Amino acid sequence: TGRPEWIWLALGTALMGLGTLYFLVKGMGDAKKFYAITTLVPAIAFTMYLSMLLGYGLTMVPFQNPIYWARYADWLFTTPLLLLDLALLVDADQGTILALVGADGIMIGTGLVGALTKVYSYRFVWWAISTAAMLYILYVLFFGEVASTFKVLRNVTVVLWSAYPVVWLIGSEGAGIVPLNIDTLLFMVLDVSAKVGFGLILLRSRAIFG
Amino acid sequence: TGRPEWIWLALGTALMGLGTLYFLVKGMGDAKKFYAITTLVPAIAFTMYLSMLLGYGLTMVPFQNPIYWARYADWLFTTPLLLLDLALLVDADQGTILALVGADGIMIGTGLVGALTKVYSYRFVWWAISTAAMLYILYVLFFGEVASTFKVLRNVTVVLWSAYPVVWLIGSEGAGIVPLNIDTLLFMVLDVSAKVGFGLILLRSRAIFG
Amino acid sequence: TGRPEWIWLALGTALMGLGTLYFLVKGMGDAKKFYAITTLVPAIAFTMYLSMLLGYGLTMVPFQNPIYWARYADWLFTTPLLLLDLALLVDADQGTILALVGADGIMIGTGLVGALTKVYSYRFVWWAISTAAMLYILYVLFFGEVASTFKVLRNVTVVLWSAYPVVWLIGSEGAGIVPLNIDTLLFMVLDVSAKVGFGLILLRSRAIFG
Ligand SMILES: *C/C=C(C)/C=C/C=C(C)/C=C/C1=C(C)CCCC1(C)C
Numbered sequence: 001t002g003r004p005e006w007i008w009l010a011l012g013t014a015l016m017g018l019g020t021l022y023f024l025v026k027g028m029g030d031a032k033k034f035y036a037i038t039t040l041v042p043a044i045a046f047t048m049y050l051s052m053l054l055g056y057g058l059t060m061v062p063f064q065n066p067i068y069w070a071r072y073a074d075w076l077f078t079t080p081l082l083l084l085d086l087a088l089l090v091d092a093d094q095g096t097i098l099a100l101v102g103a104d105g106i107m108i109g110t111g112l113v114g115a116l117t118k119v120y121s122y123r124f125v126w127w128a129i130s131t132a133a134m135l136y137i138l139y140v141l142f143f144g145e146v147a148s149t150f151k152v153l154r155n156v157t158v159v160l161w162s163a164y165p166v167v168w169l170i171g172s173e174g175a176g177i178v179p180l181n182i183d184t185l186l187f188m189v190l191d192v193s194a195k196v197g198f199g200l201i202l203l204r205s206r207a208i209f210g
Numbered sequence: 211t212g213r214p215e216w217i218w219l220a221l222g223t224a225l226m227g228l229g230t231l232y233f234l235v236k237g238m239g240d241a242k243k244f245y246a247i248t249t250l251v252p253a254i255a256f257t258m259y260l261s262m263l264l265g266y267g268l269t270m271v272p273f274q275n276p277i278y279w280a281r282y283a284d285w286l287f288t289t290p291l292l293l294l295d296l297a298l299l300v301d302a303d304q305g306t307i308l309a310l311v312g313a314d315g316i317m318i319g320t321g322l323v324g325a326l327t328k329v330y331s332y333r334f335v336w337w338a339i340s341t342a343a344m345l346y347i348l349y350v351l352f353f354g355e356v357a358s359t360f361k362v363l364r365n366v367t368v369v370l371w372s373a374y375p376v377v378w379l380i381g382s383e384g385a386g387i388v389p390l391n392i393d394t395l396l397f398m399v400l401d402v403s404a405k406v407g408f409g410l411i412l413l414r415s416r417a418i419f420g
Numbered sequence: 421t422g423r424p425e426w427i428w429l430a431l432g433t434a435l436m437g438l439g440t441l442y443f444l445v446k447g448m449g450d451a452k453k454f455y456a457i458t459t460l461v462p463a464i465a466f467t468m469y470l471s472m473l474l475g476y477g478l479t480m481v482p483f484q485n486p487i488y489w490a491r492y493a494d495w496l497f498t499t500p501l502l503l504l505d506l507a508l509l510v511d512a513d514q515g516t517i518l519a520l521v522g523a524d525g526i527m528i529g530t531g532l533v534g535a536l537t538k539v540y541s542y543r544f545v546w547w548a549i550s551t552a553a554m555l556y557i558l559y560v561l562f563f564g565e566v567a568s569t570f571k572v573l574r575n576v577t578v579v580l581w582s583a584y585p586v587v588w589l590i591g592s593e594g595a596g597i598v599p600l601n602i603d604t605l606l607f608m609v610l611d612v613s614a615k616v617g618f619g620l621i622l623l624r625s626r627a628i629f630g
């Protein structure tokens with residue numbers, strides 16, 4: 001298309017598409033639970049990447065800046081599902097799952113608001129609050145066979161989720177240090193790893209079984 | 211009102227209104243669970259039909275085409291609740307419920323996107339993806355007293371849910387073969403049967419009891 | 421800011437901010453569950469109050485009337501969480517929780533629609549329907565150590581939730597008897613009490629423990 005970042009968006013679409021199908025066929029045939037959640041994640045990401053590529057999930061924000069809003073719609077559902085996998089994995093109580101999913105909702109809802117805000121400076125305010133929520137989620141993940149995989153995914157989550165605020169911050173969504181074309185690439189590479197990459201470790205693992 | 215399809219919208223409102231109340235009084239007095247879910251469904255449909263009739267749930271989409279977006283808001287909640295009844299009925303695991311509700315969310319979210327897309331051809335793309343999700347839900351319903359009712363509702367679901375993609379496809383939302391006035395009528399007749407019609411079979415049945 | 425009601429919005433922000441933190445530190449360290457839900461509530465309210473104050477959660481509605489839509493986004497999540505605390509407290513079945521949360525969703529969704537409607541008279545129609553849903557929730561709360569606290573919070577809920585329809589009705593959202601500046605103050609005072617005020621009674625109580 002007429003947009004440089006189309007190929008990354010096309011790439012995200014295919015890669016997320018391929019993973020859903022792969023996860024879909026592997027799942028035939030707790031494990032069920034883990035397959036259910038883990039397949040939904042790239043499946044949802046797949047529709048939002050397609051929406052971004054076709055231009056539906058793109059809007060213009062004055063502060064006129066092109067903002068792909070559709071990833072927040074993605075992240076609103078797929079990140080709590082990712083937390084649930086982890087939660088599942090270690091039999092998290094309902095208190096902690098609730099806490100996590102709530103902070104997650106706050107993390108993404110405020111990121112969206114930051115994304116769509118029309119006063120430049122206020123954007124970072126929302127960035128920080130959202131970061132605070134991320135840091136709480138990461139904190140819960142750390143302080144409160146299976147315990148081996150969990151440590152893996154937890155490390156993966158930490159390294160991958162901590163990259164998003166940075167990319168948004170320096171990217172076209174934030175201070176505009178790095179152009180849209182490049183922050184779209186970074187998000188795609190994070191997203192494929194955080195979801196497809198995350199999925200294979202979990203799903204290729206016997207930790208998911210009773 | 212100045213719109214031909216007002217009477218179908220008025221009709222949906224009343225019929226969905228009447229059912230909520232009927233379900234509401236019958237429910238006094240697992241069964242509770244089945245009454246809770248089953249009454250919410252026309253209750254929600256009732257507010258969205260009212261919203262369409264008063265014109266709040268109507269918008270214009272260039273590709274300028276009048277689109278009733280409010281039914282997606284309806285379907286986003288009422289179709290997963292319908293799946294839950296079924297799930298309930300056969301003690302579905304949490305894996306399968308999750309799978310179903312996720313594909314359902316994808317089914318409606320993509321339908322909405324198709325509904326609001328401004329490139330004609332892309333609309334059908336979203337139609338197909340949404341159809342794919344429907345076909346997966348229908349597949350789960352089939353392959354994985356009470357077992358008698360369930361077969362009934364399952365047949366009902368299959369016959370009624372399979373009609374929606376067709377009406378959207380040939381209707382004013384899709385190729386525009388059939389005018390808005392008529393696709394509004396078809397959706398109303400499907401909606402009343404899928405919810406009120408569905409509700410009576412389930413609720414007049416002893417399968418709902420322990 | 422240039423808006424009279426900024427100070428109430430600033431006040432809501434701080435007070436809701438302070439409560440989240442307070443609840444956050446107290447929670448370290450069923451109880452977990454009660455802390456999880458109860459801290460999320462002002463935490464969410466905190467972001468929406470901030471959004472209103474910075475102007476993101478404010479819009480203009482013709483019928484041109486300034487409408488703070490962001491509180492519905494707040495109430496959509498925080499009021500069902502408040503109901504859940506109560507539900508928790510008395511071991512409500514899943515049927516009743518579902519019923520309550522569904523009517524709650526209807527209560528707020530219709531209030532929002534009323535809030536955004538462009539035909540003056542229709543607004544009250546949506547007001548009434550939303551009120552009907554409130555009255556059903558209040559009805560469930562009444563007709564179907566711990567039983568002592570519960571009665572307290574239930575009384576509190578009843579007195580505080582019943583005030584919202586009145587303020588909306590006479591306020592700038594409704595008939596415009598009382599100016600925006602004043603209905604913003606009333607909502608803030610209700611919100612802080614319904615959430616922070618509600619939280620302390622519950623959280624300072626041993627009813628939350630096994
Ligand atoms: C499947 C997609 C994933 C795992 C996305 C995760 C995204 C985040 C951890 C988001 C973080 C952000 C902040 C904490 C600050 C504001 C910018 C965000 C929303 C990118």
Ligand SMILES: *C/C=C(C)/C=C/C=C(C)/C=C/C1=C(C)CCCC1(C)C
Nearest residue numbers: 321337340341344371374375378404
């Ligand atoms: C209470 C309302 C019900 C049962 C509605 C169900 C609607 C569907 C099964 C929707 C299907 C659609 C597709 C699968 C393709 C795109 C068009 C839709 C959204 C009508």
Ligand SMILES: *C/C=C(C)/C=C/C=C(C)/C=C/C1=C(C)CCCC1(C)C
Nearest residue numbers: 531547550551554581584585588614
């Ligand atoms: C944390 C905020 C709370 C407890 C808000 C509760 C708000 C309501 C009980 C809302 C009620 C309303 C009606 C029943 C009629 C229409 C106007 C509303 C939405 C304010």
